[PDB]
Symmetry: C2
Subunit: 309 residues, 2 copies
Amino acid sequence: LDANKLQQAVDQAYTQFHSLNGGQNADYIPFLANVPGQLAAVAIVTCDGNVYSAGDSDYRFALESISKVCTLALALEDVGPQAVQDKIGADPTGLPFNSVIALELHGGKPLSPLVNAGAIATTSLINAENVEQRWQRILHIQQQLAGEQVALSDEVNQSEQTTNFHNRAIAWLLYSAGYLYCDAMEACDVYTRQCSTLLNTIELATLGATLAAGGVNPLTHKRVLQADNVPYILAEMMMEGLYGRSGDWAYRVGLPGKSGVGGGILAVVPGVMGIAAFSPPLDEDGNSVRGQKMVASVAKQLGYNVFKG
Amino acid sequence: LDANKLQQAVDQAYTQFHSLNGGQNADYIPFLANVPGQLAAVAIVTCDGNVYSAGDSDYRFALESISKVCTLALALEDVGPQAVQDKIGADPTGLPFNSVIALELHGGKPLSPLVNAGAIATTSLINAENVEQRWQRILHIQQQLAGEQVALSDEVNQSEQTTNFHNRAIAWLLYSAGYLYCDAMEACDVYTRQCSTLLNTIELATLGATLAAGGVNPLTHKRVLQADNVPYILAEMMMEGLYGRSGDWAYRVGLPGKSGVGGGILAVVPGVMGIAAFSPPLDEDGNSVRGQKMVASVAKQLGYNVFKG
């Protein structure tokens, strides 16, 4: 890959979109509400371990629901794809991230590991002897996939843990229906923790690059996932990673992606690179306004789309 | 490509799955109920125009909802991708092929050109001065995409036109909500006609190969679609092509696909080939039991999956 073209792509995406108005920070906890709204970054991490970025690319923001990708990756390593498909699902819900209508319409089955209900079920599916081991193994895979500096924010975790009533409900609905594989409050607790780590845009792009490299983190030169597991992760992302706007994302960008309420957007170019961006203001679907545009811009400038031969 | 590998894949898929038990013929009209249940075929058509087949690959079956792809293609040519996204949508519904719950939960918007509601809306969006021109233009693009012998069955059409009450309802719901772009009964009629053409398994594979070649029919060597429009078609197929099992399809196979109740299964390997299979007995989601397995088998043997780098 041409280093000049890659650096130009992130530079131009940043220049074109970094100050674009629109959207609002997540504000259900003060930490998210208080993140300076003008911060903005975009980065590429290639399968060969080269890194290109623009903007506030070291600024560490809350992982939040991007954590769903990492725990999914672990569940696949632990129990394999058939078990994940049977116990969690592989289908989009057509409904918001926290939709209980979705559950009741599918007999309690969460359908996707990337909506909150599926993610809580996937967290409960991880091999673990007790709650702290469950957390330790999830924290470790996040560090393996995105970088060793990824770490729990006490402030974010304390805020999330004391406001997550609707996820407590979801955990009990899953448990009641047969779609939760450990104690309900353990699952809810660990799910909350996994959302409460902090990473920067380069680290997010690294998660992408690990997936693009078929499970090898190109910065640490370490195989974290089995290659054969990666397409399942990316398929799940294509179907639901941007919630109700996943189809719009597939239509416009054509790369498997994931958003979080910290303002992160990840996309994967299979075999080639991770692309990520960050900016706190979110659209009505919970997806970073600028983050989406900056990732789409890089992908469009470099000609990457899995629906283009 | 390795022609020996392609023929071997088709032959092994057919051997392995052509007599697999399961499912039942669509039977809501007598034509579909009476098609011999044991018929089965699989085929590849490549971007270079080579054809590899096994089984009853000359047998002509009803196109049915696979027609939704051709009409989407024509709508993109006529009004472009922004207009399709605004007037029809690009998102999966989470709900069955004929779901009116899906409509009412999204304020009347059909969400996807590949569910019945969106397909009727897409048929209504096509440029036309009257109903017969609307039909002629749609028939012509089916023939351009899949093969010149594609033609309306009077018997299928008559049976569909006299039993399509639920689609008449959907047409009126769209019209009432503002998501129908011509007369309601004209859109419903023409949608019915487009579903009532007959094609064989090589023609269905050719449809896929036209898409795979970026809009060029590799048997006639004619450009039918703009290359830039094809990724939109494929994204829509990835989201909703196999209805509520599209996610499962993306997870297991990882190629954009489409089913119809005539027993056809289509998959597209972007830039490489169309893969198709046929067998009348359908599963509970309306998807051919053997058809899905044969197409999946060819794709796995050859290693094709858009999420694998």
